[PDB]
Assembly symmetry: D2
């Protein structure tokens, strides 16, 4: 393609990086100022623009616009200082963006499918420029992080997730599709908000909702193929599980919040074991929350424990859960079949601190979006019953973190092992030792899992894929990392980590013959490495070459 | 047109204003959130976005992006509150933008022709999406406002002018082309500036430059037609004049800085006469500056006086000028033929205040871009020998204004009649009366002159056109306006004033047979009104309708 | 798509079959006369146009132009009377077309890859509008039917083959790509021909040629996938066999001339056995020719005989061949490894008639492109030592057929069982009985084999596929068919036969796990039927529908 | 503009008169046979096609 149409297509636009000869051939010479530069120069300019801003939202908006203008440059900047820009494009800033999505909105991104478009989804996929999609992150916006129902403002998440698909996983941008399934919203505040971009009516539930979802899945895989990876993100509890169970074995799909979190959670405990000097089956885990994350994580912990040689029954007995009504115990009221799995014989309790004192767990996991649930008392108690207690404040965004790295280390005398879903700066204990709290976030799992699935075309994703991936991650945590308090490999190495996760997933796929990409590559690492996205700009010059002169003569 | 490419075309893009039916027919249903809204709603969000910003530079980028995303919306927002947004799109903010163009740069706009493209201009015009252009604003960036040589960063100016072409004149945006002729820059600072977007070398002068200009004019008129309007803007002294004289009679062109300024300046004096209760031939004008603006304004003033009944010779004797070397007197050194035209018998002088006290003028016009040249002294002196002195601080941007509205009104005890190139807020005198200083800026002239020339196809623009336009503008100043201290009709009525300027120019054109649009309209006003740009969106639904039924049958 | 561009795209163009509403929405209303018609009406006008022509070459051109104008209409016409149009679009007219390709040329069709394009094939595949190709028919034009080296004029063959892919097989036209690999031509006549459209130089051979082919296969499968079907057609002997052997197990490819012909020839023998009332192992085959067709057929026959219980050695003993040097016997000079395979101990012989009298075969197959090789004497001899001799004049086009249907039936006194590569009209014997000579032509094999490979994605095509296909075809020959003298099912049922061929190929592909399309359909016949091409026009009206009214409300 | 779309537009289409370089830049190299001819060589082939016709209506259609 050519002309000014190129400058408006972010997948093609190189900006002033366009060569004098490229510009001339593309019929755009004169539409750009008379200066030519490389990505480094362009990155410089962006940083000057980023530096001068004075609000995270403004930084977000700046980057989102870059993403809408020059694809390569966007990712070049992202990967240039992942630790610096991820907090803007992903948690916690992405939640802030979703809260003001109507305000931050500029150019649309993604595919918005409505409950009112039932029976016409197949047609709408046509509207999407790309005809070859290999991955999709979808949400209905009912459980945006620990922020609740943000309706159509929730589109910010899929966009963020996919940003890492490329930035941290190497998955090509052009093959991914962020999707919003707006069936309404129960958030009264949004329904009254003048800037709200979604349907102004309560969420439609029941059979209608279910049929919408079936059509979506059927339509996507029909157009893009049965190998298309569908990643559910931030759906409400009930919907999340039923949908997973319903499609898990029918399509190539998985739920990030349920399975991706479990993977990273276990990856941290597996790593923590090298500090606590014991076996996972010697621990006693207590969850604040009993939803998607808790239930997903708890299940993976059990599989991990059985792998150690313990029985399924013994493993489940070491896992305790607390929901909005209190400690989940046998015979308690308001219990679900899934919760009943961890209902143990015990009197009922409501106060979290009393529960911590009673259960005396070795691992405290926070996944209930409850502010500073992990108070100094709770933290002190953990430091009291444990030589080195493991503390996981997983709720996102930052404002929902069960506790801070600072407080964790402060109230546990620097003996607590910490991890959180949202980023925290390093902490220098009184002893002068600087600890670097790790980020237990999906971000360590979904990019590699995607690179993997897409690479070998794994037909379906079993729970073993996440357990194995939890091991691959932990295997990348160095002794040096561990000594700094890191339960995960440094973020700057995320790409390398993703590759390994991808290669490992491929090896298993072919082994169990669940793969689809054939013939099988003689060297999987080499093959996947060659399938990864490249930050470099392509050359838009026509492929000119000469023929012998006799054969090229004009008659 | 078609699909997503529609959403990237600002001339077409309607954003969420596209109807469900339009989106479905345009193959973009799904690419936009599930909410449909009108322009009012769209303007609201834009304002909430403009409101939260905290820098003029930022507000500029905001609007500029808007213009790159939704044409109709952009202009709907500007005219919604011209007095509020013009300062952002035009003076003085536009000057600040030019100073930091490299930084503010996002998406390119306009046509950038280089000195190294000599012999290829014709082809480059093709790279421009539009093949039908009626107006063109060119600059080489050597004299950007009173900011000097800003090289390629000067592109911001033609874009500003054109913005007003539409917003103030009603000229259709799609038919206008902003152009930057980059032949280098002598600004050592820019040459070292890492963000500079132009050619990194001193300006090329001599015959190479002249050939480039001739080619440009030729290229532009051959492609777009002889009737194409070429507006020269912000060129250096020497070039501005010779280029104007060189193409004046050959093509449809004029120089905004020399002729447009002259027109508005005369319009103001004509209005002031109704406060000073005398005739223009009764005044004595003193110009701080003897450049493009000064010489142009002086020339029109002379014509205006002669039209009163005074002789050429007598008129000239009433104009005094001061340049970098001091008062322009007969037999002084460093004099140009143009300047020696106003060189009177008198002793040399350099001190401005002493010059004011010696010549004792009734009107003081500042056009030398000298900060606060009109000091307390000067202003007091003026209010001393003049019952009601006329003070014109025309230099731009604000930072160059010879003096402020507050200063003028205070140091002239409220008896001074003020006007300036850049905007100043209302002033409330100690007497309790609030004055609304007018803005003597080209903006009152070029929009209407363009509407006029384009509408009737006036082959060439003579000085009479600007004198007539000056009378037209003054004619629209009401007694009420005068009573408030306005030498110009309120800015909120600028569209109507442009209409009358256009209608007038048309009538003259047909009378003198210099028009080209035939047959001549019976009602010039009605004709022009129907030629004006509309801010309303068009409907993108296919024009569907039925034929009988026997004729519509399928055989 | 939209606009006049639609009318020029044969894959979209519906002609006057475009609905008024379609024309209005596609922006073509007014570009077509004021009448709307159905396909039947359109076919009628085509037939009127075909009727008035007076030459086969002109009928060819008419139909080729139809194909370049309206795709569906083209195939609608072909399938409306396959027995009438196939002889025009295929053998023998296609051979005539190729001989005058330069003269018949109008609009180009297919992909022309030259030997001078080595190292740039991948680039050239981009030039091709479709990015999703599933089948390709390639030729270098060195052995076009029995007409020899027709160089670039040979493009007519791949175009013809693919015409039947769709017409007889049901394969989608847009997913197929006809390719010509021009490396020159040794035909002195064409080099001198002023209308020749290929490279005017002797064919390039050796390593250069082999590298071009490797690059071709690599580029095609890299861009279109390893499952892309590559059908080699009309390559010279040496090149045909080595290319087949070299890529056979590496890509999804087969050689129509060697393998397709084998399949159809055995299909006919299988059917013939039901007339001769005996087993294949009871016959003695004699081939007039020892090349691509001869060796391929000979090979399939052997496999067929072994499946009856006979050993490989015993089977080979029943097959004799004659080449340009005469009867192929042990120790004979100028023999090939492949030929030596059938070199039996026997005295050398050169005269075909004498050879027939000596070997006394029960099956006479002609594949040497030798005019009327099967003389009256030979035909009489065959009817002398065989109650019911089986005569196959497989050489194409008709002017190369070993003998005519009339001649065969006349000189065998109506006892000879006939079949030919090119069509012959029914024959009414003196007894009054009318026989319908069958057509033993690849056309019975490649369409169905293609529909099958493409459908289930069979990685590689082994000879078993052709042997089973032969059985599938013979299975479709009814008792009635046989009684009329038909060795193959009637042409009018070819689409039904192809389907059966495909469903069987699929079944075995999944059984042997050599398929690629997964999950496997529960009903293969139903799946494949749903994938077949539809001759009906699509509806180009936008998918319009409404949402509730509150959700459609414009703010 | 470019691509096979150019071959279909009679105002732009040059047939085999398109140069090797033109074809490569227009993204149509390969859509035309490996032969380059001038207008007169093209006229010649038109005349041969005209000559063999035997009806004015056919010559009209050609
Ligand atoms: N990688 C990561 O770091 C990651 C990944 C996914 C999710 N998360 C975070 O985890 C949080 C929840 O996600 P989810 O998917 O698990 O949501 P969910 O399914 O809604 O689960 C939330 C749970 O918290 C419980 N809860 C509410 N108030 C409580 C209270 N006062 N005391 C104890 N428990 C209480 C709820 O109880 P009931 O059962 O009574 O309703 C519910 O079971 C979010 O903030 C999210 O951002 C982090
Ligand atoms: N509509 C409007 O409000 C409008 C329109 C056009 C221009 N302007 C303003 O007018 C200003 C100049 O524009 P221009 O085109 O006339 O520029 P120009 O051609 O550069 O002329 C500037 C003149 O000022 C003289 N000068 C410089 N310093 C002086 C000093 N210290 N004391 C006395 N005279 C001095 C120069 O003298 P020499 O000849 O000796 O060098 C020169 O004649 C700009 O700031 C611009 O913003 C306003
Ligand atoms: N589906 C169909 O019905 C179908 C498909 C493919 C081909 N065919 C036809 O089969 C014929 C041959 O094609 P091919 O691909 O097999 O070509 P090929 O590989 O060149 O084989 C031709 C063979 O005929 C031999 N020959 C030449 N003159 C002979 C003569 N006077 N007496 C006996 N044998 C002679 C040649 O012998 P040497 O080796 O000594 O040179 C050669 O072995 C063509 O006319 C073609 O149209 C029909
Ligand atoms: O749900 C979340 O909070 C996440 O995935 O980071
Ligand atoms: O030059 C200027 O400042 C203008 O034209 O307003
Ligand atoms: O080459 C041939 O003769 C054929 O394919 O039928
Ligand atoms: Cl850039
Ligand atoms: Cl013919
Ligand atoms: Cl012949
Ligand atoms: Cl038949
Ligand atoms: Cl139809
Ligand atoms: Mn999530
Ligand atoms: Mn200016
Ligand atoms: Mn063939
Ligand atoms: Na006919
Ligand atoms: Na053809
Ligand atoms: Na193989
Ligand atoms: Na033999
Ligand atoms: Na041609």
């Amino acid at each position: 393609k050519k002309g000014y149409e190129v400058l408006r297509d972010p997948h093609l636009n190189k900006g002033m990086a366009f060569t004098l000869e490229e510009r001339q051939q593309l019929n755009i010479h004169g539409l750009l100022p008379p200066c030519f530069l490389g990505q480094d120069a362009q990155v410089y300019s962006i940083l000057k623009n980023f530096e001068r801003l004075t609000s995270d939202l403004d930084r977000y908006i700046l980057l989102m616009s870059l993403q809408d203008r020059n694809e390569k440059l966007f990712y070049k900047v992202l990967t240039s200082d992942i630790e610096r820009f991820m907090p803007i494009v992903y948690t916690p800033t992405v939640g802030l963006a979703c809260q003001h999505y109507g305000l931050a909105f500029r150019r649309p991104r993604g595919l918005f499918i409505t409950i009112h478009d039932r029976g016409h989804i197949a047609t709408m996929l046509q509207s999407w420029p790309e005809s070859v999609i290999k991955a999709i992150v979808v949400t209905d916006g009912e459980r945006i992080l620990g922020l609740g129902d943000l309706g159509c403002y929730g589109m910010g998440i899929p966009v963020g997730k996919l940003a890492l698909y490329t930035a941290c996983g190497g998955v090509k941008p052009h093959q991914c599709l962020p999707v919003m399934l707006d069936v309404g919203t129960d958030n009264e505040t949004l329904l009254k908000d003048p800037l709200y971009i979604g349907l102004r009516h309560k969420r439609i539930r029941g059979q209608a909702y279910d049929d919408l979802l079936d059509e979506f899945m059927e339509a996507v895989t029909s157009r893009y193929g049965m190998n298309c990876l569908i990643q559910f993100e931030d759906f409400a509890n009930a919907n999340a599980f039923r949908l997973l169970h319903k499609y898990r074995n029918k399509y190539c799909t998985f739920n990030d919040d349920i399975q991706g979190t479990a993977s990273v959670a276990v990856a941290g405990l597996l790593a923590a074991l090298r500090i606590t000097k014991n076996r996972l089956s010697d621990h006693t885990v207590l969850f604040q929350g009993a939803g998607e994350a808790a239930l997903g994580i708890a299940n993976l912990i059990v599989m991990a424990m059985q792998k150690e040689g313990v029985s399924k029954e013994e493993a489940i007995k070491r896992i305790w859960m607390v929901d909005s009504k209190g400690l989940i115990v046998k015979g308690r009221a308001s219990l679900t079949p899934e919760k009943e799995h961890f209902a143990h014989e015990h009197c009922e309790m409501k106060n979290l601190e009393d529960i911590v004192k009673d259960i005396k767990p070795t691992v405290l996991i926070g996944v209930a979006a409850i502010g500073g649930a992990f108070t100094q008392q709770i933290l002190q108690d953990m430091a009291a019953f444990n030589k080195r207690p493991i503390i996981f404040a997983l709720s996102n965004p930052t404002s929902k973190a069960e506790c801070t790295a600072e407080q964790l280390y402060k109230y546990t005398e620097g003996r607590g092992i910490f991890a959180s879903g949202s980023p925290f700066d390093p902490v220098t204990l009184p002893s002068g030792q600087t600890l670097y709290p790790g980020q237990g976030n999906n971000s360590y799992v979904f990019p590699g899992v995607a690179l993997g699935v897409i690479s070998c075309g794994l037909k379906h994703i079993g729970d073993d894929v996440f357990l194995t991936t939890a091991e691959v991650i932990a295997q990348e945590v160095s002794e040096e990392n561990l000594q700094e308090g890191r339960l995960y490999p440094p973020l700057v190495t995320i790409q390398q980590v993703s590759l390994k996760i991808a290669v490992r997933i491929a090896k298993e796929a072919y082994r169990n013959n669940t793969a689809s990409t054939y013939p099988q590559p003689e060297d999987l690492e080499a093959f996947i490495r060659s399938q990864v996205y490249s930050t470099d700009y392509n050359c838009f010059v026509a492929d000119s070459y000469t023929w012998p002169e006799e054969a090229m003569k004009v008659k």
